Amino acid sequence: KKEPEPNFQLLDNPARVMPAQLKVLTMPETCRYQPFKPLSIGGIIILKDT
Secondary structure, eight states: OOOOOOOOOOOOSSOOOOGGGGGGOOOOTTOSOEESSOTTSOSOOOEEOO
16 A cells, blocks of 8 residues: 655644654754753753854
8 A cells, every 4th residue: 555654754944743742842943943951851942043
C-alpha cells in the first residue's frame, strides 16, 4: 500500500502540545528567534531575538 511516515511535524506559535510529548519538542532550527529557557517546560515563554 503506502508507508509515507512523515517522521517530524511543524506547528505554529500557540501550539497544542500534549504533555507526555513535550520532551521531544523539535526547536525551531536556525530561526530568527531563540528560546530564553529550556523548551522542555510548557506554557508561556519569552523569546530572545536577533
